[PDB]
Amino acid sequence: SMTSALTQGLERIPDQLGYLVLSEGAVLASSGDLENDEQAASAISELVSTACGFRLHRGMNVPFKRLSVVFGEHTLLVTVSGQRVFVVKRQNR
Amino acid sequence: MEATLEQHLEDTMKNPSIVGVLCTDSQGLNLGCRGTLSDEHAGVISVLAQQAAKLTSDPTDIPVVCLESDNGNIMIQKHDGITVAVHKMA
């Protein structure tokens, strides 16, 4: 409509290409490139299990909010809420 | 400036944002660390740097293992054959 409206599109978001959820070290749901393979399901679990064990003795007992692992062309962002692990797999900009 | 390794550790720490640095090569062995990082973290940083590389279907994709949180975000890149650990403020 306006100069400040639909016409002005709003900042795009990079496409998603894989989604993943594990619970109790088991794949609840999985789509995109994260098909049913136990590569990322298994591999992240201990990446998560190790990355979660990095206390740093300054902010103690809570060694992260989110764990990105950036690649050249695609990114993984991982979340945990009570041993339910989320990975989003997308593009970088 | 004949480029010594402890130059950069004192050199990257110039930055107000940079809060500590640490170096490791794939052993868990501290090779020098400033600021927030110490010897406890040498083993932990290596392993997550090491396991995150298994997701590399094949190499030459260097996953900077970025790691957000409250105190700060922590990049981890295995790098020049030596795993580097920056700790920024974002």
Side-chain angles (χ1 to χ4, degrees), chain A residues 19-47 85 87, chain B residues 51 54-55:
Chain A
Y19 289 80
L20 201 295
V21 191
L22 297 310
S23 176
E24 330 161 306
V27 49
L28 283 207
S30 67
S31 157
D33 181 76
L34 291 293
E35 81 205 330
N36 38 69
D37 52 29
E38 263 288 359
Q39 63 164 27
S42 60
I44 297 103
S45 161
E46 186 41 272
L47 210 173
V85 310
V87 348
Chain B
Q51 46 211 9
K54 264 312 301 153
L55 323 179

Side-chain angles (χ1 to χ4, degrees), chain B residues 1-16:
Chain B
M1 189 175 90
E2 196 28 272
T4 171
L5 174 74
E6 278 261 353
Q7 192 160 6
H8 293 106
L9 252 72
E10 281 235 354
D11 180 278
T12 60
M13 196 104 356
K14 315 145 140 167
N15 280 36

Side-chain angles (χ1 to χ4, degrees), chain A residues 70-83:
Chain A
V70 180
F71 308 76
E73 32 172 0
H74 86 80
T75 309
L76 308 203
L77 52 151
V78 181
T79 325
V80 181
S81 322
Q83 190 71 12

Side-chain angles (χ1 to χ4, degrees), chain B:
Chain B
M1 189 175 90
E2 196 28 272
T4 171
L5 174 74
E6 278 261 353
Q7 192 160 6
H8 293 106
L9 252 72
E10 281 235 354
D11 180 278
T12 60
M13 196 104 356
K14 315 145 140 167
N15 280 36
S17 302
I18 310 272
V19 169
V21 201
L22 181 153
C23 303
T24 286
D25 169 25
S26 85
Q27 272 278 14
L29 290 186
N30 181 4
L31 269 42
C33 55
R34 298 287 182 298
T36 37
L37 300 322
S38 325
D39 182 64
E40 315 92 329
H41 295 356
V44 307
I45 293 200
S46 165
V47 54
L48 51 93
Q50 263 298 279
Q51 46 211 9
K54 264 312 301 153
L55 323 179
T56 69
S57 78
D58 59 45
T60 313
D61 266 354
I62 298 95
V64 311
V65 179
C66 182
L67 158 49
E68 278 87 355
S69 167
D70 187 294
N71 287 323
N73 316 320
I74 299 198
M75 311 76 136
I76 284 142
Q77 184 195 180
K78 215 217 152 178
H79 196 204
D80 261 342
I82 166 216
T83 324
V84 191
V86 201
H87 172 58
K88 277 200 68 292
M89 303 207 130

Side-chain angles (χ1 to χ4, degrees), chain A residues 2-19:
Chain A
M2 274 330 167
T3 170
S4 46
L6 285 321
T7 38
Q8 145 194 346
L10 259 75
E11 269 186 359
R12 94 301 301 161
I13 289 204
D15 313 348
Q16 293 92 335
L17 285 78
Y19 289 80

